[PDB]
Design a binder for this molecule. Sequence first.
Ligand SMILES: O=C(NC[C@]1(O)CCCN(c2cc(NCc3ccccc3)ncn2)C1)c1ccc(CN2CC3(CCC3)[C@@H]2C2CC2)cc1O
Lengths: 200, 240
Amino acid sequence: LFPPQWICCDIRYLDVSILGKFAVVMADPPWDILPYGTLTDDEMRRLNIPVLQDDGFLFLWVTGRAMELGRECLNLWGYERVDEIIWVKTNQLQRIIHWLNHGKEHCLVGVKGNPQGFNQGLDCDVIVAEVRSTSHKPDEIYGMIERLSPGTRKIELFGRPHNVQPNWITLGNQLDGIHLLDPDVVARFKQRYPDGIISK
Amino acid sequence: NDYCQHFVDTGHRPQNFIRDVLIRLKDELIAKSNTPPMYLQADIEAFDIRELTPKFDVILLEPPLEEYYRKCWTWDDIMKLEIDEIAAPRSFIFLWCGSGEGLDLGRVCLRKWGYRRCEDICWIKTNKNNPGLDPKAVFQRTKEHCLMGIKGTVDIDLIITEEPEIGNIEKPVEIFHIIEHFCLGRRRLHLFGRDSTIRPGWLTVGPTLTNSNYNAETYASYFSAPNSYLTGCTEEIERL
Ligand SMILES: O=C(NC[C@]1(O)CCCN(c2cc(NCc3ccccc3)ncn2)C1)c1ccc(CN2CC3(CCC3)[C@@H]2C2CC2)cc1O
């Protein structure tokens, strides 16, 4: 159901089996690289990503030692890494913002199953875009994902209010409440959470 | 503007629109301390890499991957290179990994040889001159990765050039500039270099070299005392 949907929750504890299956998953995790909201490496490994898709793509933002740990998670969750997007960070005039200064952010692209009917090869694997507010991912990624898999259901983990999008369900503990419009999801949510509380 | 949509509309890669892409004395110091270029033709698959002495401070490894071509080395071949046998206990590696499975297998190699990855240097290829396909790919691949690894106790991680003509496998010479600016020491090895990559300050070993001048005793004499620990960015040690 096309309009934006979201669930404020601790993603460690939400039963994601109520959300159904998704053509695309995106995650921008608070890797332990500790600061508020961080997940330990074990908590990351244990996320029930495998129930979220049968055939489709996973987009996983990584930095520092999560370039390696994110590969471990992707493989443990059942994905093969088949691309790596980089976002070249620029100012409003298109100039680039330990051993080297860092001009880019990285997003691994994993595949699970054997997706059919996606539009692979429409976009390239380099994003050039302005840092529109620190710590945000560039909005361009939603466009590339929509051209890749138009009209399908998508789910974002560890998103924020600015991330909510049509065709997407956004999960994160800084969202405002619970806003669900898909009847399949609404039905399974009330069944699983009759009193609206998501604990343990 | 959305340069991704623009690429979909026009075939111009988003990197085509990046613009503008006191160190000179340091480049001069590098040039002053560079050893003479030295080079050896050797079939690396049949060659006992331990004959390469002494142990190196920097290794640049550029195996000819199949994806570079519209004798190729598989990651099976590369992984079985015994790089840890010629790397100094404190030393650095720069591994060109391409754009596909090498991004994973190259990391397996680094760990196999005792390195941890400390940077990921991306060569972004523009197509300004020709605006506008691996079966696994989700996106058009417009870059290559050079992983930097470290073992033991000014520049950006991007190189931007126009995509070379088909059949040209050369990597951007800018990678040498980045490596030399780190001032990591003077024993520098380029495995799978070519006549076209030979460079002062570097020992180049590769199968297609047409000539050799490598002599292990002569090479070691460049780093004998008092010169054993120079960074390659400091002034020569006065003799006579
Ligand atoms: O601000 C974020 N995200 C919202 C939260 O709300 C913020 C509190 C944590 N967070 C949770 C955490 C959670 N469970 C664990 C918990 C533990 C202790 C107390 C409470 C909860 N469940 C749901 N959301 C999620 C956030 C901000 C920055 C980054 C870093 N990337 C931005 C980047 C993309 C291009 C640049 C870069 C990537 C590496 C390359 C990741 C983030 O994710």
